[PDB]
Amino acid sequence: LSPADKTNVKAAWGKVGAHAGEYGAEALERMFLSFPTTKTYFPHFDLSHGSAQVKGHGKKVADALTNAVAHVDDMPNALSALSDLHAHKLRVDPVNFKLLSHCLLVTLAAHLPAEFTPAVHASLDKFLASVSTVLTSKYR
């Protein structure tokens, strides 16, 4: 991650603002539709169109993401509480993090076209991958 990528990421998720909680909800929904095997990680959940469980969890993913962009120079310590849940408790396969980051990138491209430029895209994919790397590292 470069400071040029940091300026691209801050600007991109700076334009999402309040929509992030709904963007994360769409990105979540897209993952279950595109890659059904990911639904095993949600055994009780109701994963249908326009669900408060998906919308509420969408806000959780987006709030963790807004903290990550604000703490871009300190990600393993700021996301430490989440890195323990995803790696020790949930033990999510790192492939699923590539799948959600892809759907998140799809949602950003669909809602923000003037912002989703190849320079922003490359930085966003780098940001999400480093967020994924941090989230799926605290395990042994």
């Binding site: 190849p118 490359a122 994919d125």
Partner: protein
């Protein structure tokens, strides 16, 4: 593994897809998002920054060839392995491209589709295109698989 509702949504959206100006940004974004893929296209010249890659006449012209290959496979979904048979050989033994990059371009193509259509590229439409990009990537990696 595409059903009539999925197979129709794939073709209906592809009718609006401009064959000459969709693959160019897909090949371009691949070279910007995953820049190690530039080693294969170094006869092209300058790829210094994202703008240079996007504004490269050779990049956009090669994108037409890639999207042209994707388009013929979209009509021949029944036997994708036979349709991409000649390309699967050239992409693996003639020019050593790692089979991981095939699904990288596919998932980049999906990002370009959302970027162009916006709300029109809905989650079930993405789900339909995901089975296609996984199929094409698999059909282009069989010459070792």
């Amino acid at each position: 593994h595409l059903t009539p509702e999925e197979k129709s949504a794939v073709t209906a959206l592809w009718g609006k897809v401009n064959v000459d100006e969709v693959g160019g940004e897909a090949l371009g974004r691949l070279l910007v998002v995953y820049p190690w893929t530039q080693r294969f296209f170094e006869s092209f010249g300058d790829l210094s920054t994202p703008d240079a890659v996007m504004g490269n006449p050779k990049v956009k012209a090669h994108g037409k060839k890639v999207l042209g290959a994707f388009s013929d496979g979209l009509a021949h979904l029944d036997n994708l392995k036979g349709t991409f048979a000649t390309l699967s050989e050239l992409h693996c033994d003639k020019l050593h491209v790692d089979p991981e990059n095939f699904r990288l371009l596919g998932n980049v193509l999906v990002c370009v589709l959302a970027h162009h259509f916006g709300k029109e590229f809905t989650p079930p439409v993405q789900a339909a295109y995901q089975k296609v990009v996984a199929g094409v990537a698999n059909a282009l990696a069989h010459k070792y698989h």
